[PDB]
Amino acid sequence: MVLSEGEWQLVLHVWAKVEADVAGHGQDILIRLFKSHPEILEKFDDLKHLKTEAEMKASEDLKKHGVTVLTALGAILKKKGHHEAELKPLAQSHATKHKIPIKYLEFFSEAIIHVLHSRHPGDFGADAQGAMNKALELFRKDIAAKYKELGYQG
Numbered sequence: 290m291v292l293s294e295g296e297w298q299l300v301l302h303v304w305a306k307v308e309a310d311v312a313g314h315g316q317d318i319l320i321r322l323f324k325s326h327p328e329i330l331e332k333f334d335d336l337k338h339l340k341t342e343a344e345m346k347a348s349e350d351l352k353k354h355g356v357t358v359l360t361a362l363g364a365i366l367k368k369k370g371h372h373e374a375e376l377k378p379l380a381q382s383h384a385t386k387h388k389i390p391i392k393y394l395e396f397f398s399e400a401i402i403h404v405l406h407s408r409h410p411g412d413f414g415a416d417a418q419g420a421m422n423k424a425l426e427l428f429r430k431d432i433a434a435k436y437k438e439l440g441y442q443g
C-alpha cells in the first residue's frame with residue numbers, strides 16, 4: 290500500500306500532537322497495550338512486576354520505554370514510507386535480540402490509535418484515523434519483509 294502526500298500530511302499533523310508530549314503519550318500507549326495484552330507485559334523483564342495503572346504511570350522505566358518507542362516511530366513516520374534505513378536496526382533489536390511477532394506490532398498499533406482518539410478527538414476524525422492506520426500498516430508490512438530478509442518469519 291502507498292500513502293499520498295495528503296495522507297502523509299494527516300499522519301504528521303496528528304503526530305505533531307504526540308510530539309508536544311512524547312513521554313505522556315508513550316505512557317498512555319504502553320499502559321493501554323499492557324492492559325489489553327498482559328501477555329505482552331510479561332516480555333518486559335523490567336516492567337512485568339507492574340500490577341496496576343497507577344504503578345505503570347509512576348514507573349520511570351516505563352516512561353523511558355515509551356519515549357524510546359515513540360522517538361523511533363516518529364522518525365520512521367517522518368520518512369513518509371522511505372524508511373528502509375530506519376527499519377534495519379529496528380528489526381534487529383526485534384528479530385535477533387528478541388523475537389517480536391508482527392501480531393504484537395499490530396496490538397501496539399491498536400493502542401496508538403486508541404490513545405490518539407482518546408487525547409485528540411477534535412484532531413483525529415475518520416480520515417486521520419484511516420491515514421494513521423494506513424501508515425502503521427505500511428510500517429508493519431515493511432518490518433515483516435525486513436524480518437524475513439534477516440531470517441525471521443515474524
Ligand code: HEM
Nearest residue numbers: 329332333357358359361362382383387389393394396397
Ligand atoms: C507489542 C509490541 C512490542 C514489543 C512486545 C516490543 C518489545 C521489545 C523488546 C522486548 C525490546 C528489547 C528489550 C530491551 O532491551 O529493553 C525492544 C526493543 C526496541 N523496540 Fe520494541 N517492542 C514492541 C513494539 C515496538 C515499536 C512499535 C517500536 C517503534 C516503532 C519499538 C521500538 C523499539 C526500539 C527502538 C528498541 C531498541 C531499544 C534500545 O535499543 O534500547 N518497539 N522491543
